[PDB]
Structure 1
Amino acid sequence: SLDQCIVNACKNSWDKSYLAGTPNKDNASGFVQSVAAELGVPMPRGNANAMVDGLEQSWTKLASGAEAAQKAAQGFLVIAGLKGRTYGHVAVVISGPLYRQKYPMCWCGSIAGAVGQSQGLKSVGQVWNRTDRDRLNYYVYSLASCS
């Protein structure tokens, strides 16, 4: 699996602060901004909702969580995102066996504390709730980031 540079980018972004005085681990949008900046990949800017709008307008959309993990394994940056009426949430998908045989492993910060966060050991079906887990969108950047 060729996702090592993305995993590293996540680890490195975890202690950074894209926003002044705001550790990425407590800020979903910021966290993926730092991941993207570290991989030389243009990321739509803004809060989670704004980012999902931009990803929807300009990025490739994948069919499943399985296709998402596959794309991570091939070295592509993959964002799982979902708008909310109030606030959305985004996360970086990484390679690894699918949780409940459906949902890919991920990294994500969250203002919600530990229950919202993941350091690669929670899947998207353990960050997002039971109903939301099945509504996620998966976006992949058009060029691979890992050689």
Structure 2
Amino acid sequence: SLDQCIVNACKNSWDKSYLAGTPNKDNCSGFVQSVAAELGVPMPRGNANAMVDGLEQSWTKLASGAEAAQKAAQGFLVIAGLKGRTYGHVAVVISGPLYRQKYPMCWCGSIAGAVGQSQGLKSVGQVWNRTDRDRLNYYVYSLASCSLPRAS
């Protein structure tokens, strides 16, 4: 794919509650935490702003959304993130055609409701406001999370 393991982790994480009592579909940071936990990727703790701060300090940053999609297609966990004045947002980037040839497809939950939610059917350029989508950071983990295709 080779992002099938990541897509699977997204699907599995959608109905989980990383923070007890708070469905991940209603909590962007919790959703990403559950995905990372399933994949065995260490993550900074906390809300979206805190996670972005941690990723900024420790993870390789990609140059573009196009590169983000390519890395996800190679089996890497790639997080799109941007800090907010009051609330930030984070999302998992997956492989797929770029929206407006620029913005990669994603999975994310959000307390905002539908506008901040994507089950792989929206891009980061639809979830984030127009004044934010060109300001996103894309962080990739140092090792691929996905495995070889099935042997048989």
Deviations 1:27-62 (A, max 9, x none): 000000000000000011100000000000000000
Structure 2: distance between partners of 1:123 and 1:44: 24
Distance 1:61 1:18 in 2: 25
* Pairwise CA distance, 1:142: 0.2
**Residues in 1 aligned to 2:89 and 2:113: alpha-carbon distance in whole angstroms:** 13
Tell me, what secondary structure is at the counterpart of 1:85? coil
Query: 2 CA distance for matches of 1:44 and 1:137?
Result: 16
- Partners of 1:3 and 1:23 in 2: how far apart? 24
Please list every run of 5 or more consecutive structure 1 residues that lacks an aligned counterpart in the other structure: none
**TM-score, normalized by length of structure 2?**
0.95
Deviation, 1:24, is: 0.2
Q: Offset of 1:87 from its aligned partner?
A: 0.8
Question: How much does 1:131 deviate?
Answer: 1.0
Q: Distance in 2 between matches of 1:96 and 1:19?
A: 30
1:128 deviates by 0.1
Give ranges in structure 2 of 5+ residues lacking alignment: 147-151
Please state how far the C-alpha of 1:115 moved relative to its aligned partner.
1.1
Distance 2:86 2:17 in 1: 23
1:48 corresponding residue in structure 2? 48
Q: Alpha-carbon deviation of 1:15?
A: 0.2
1:84 matched residue in structure 2: 84
Report the alpha carbon displacement of residue 120 of structure 1 after superposing the two structures with TM: 0.2
Counterpart secondary structure, 2:37: helix
Moved over 3 A (4+): none
State the alpha-carbon separation in 1 of the partners of residues 43 and 11 from structure 2: 18
| Higher gyration radius (CA) | 2
Deviations 1:57-106 (A, max 9, x none): 00000000000000000000000000011110000000001000000000
Report the equivalent of 1:3.
3
Aligned partners of 1:44, 1:74: CA distance in 2, in Å?
23
Q: Which residue of 2 aligns with 1:118?
A: 118
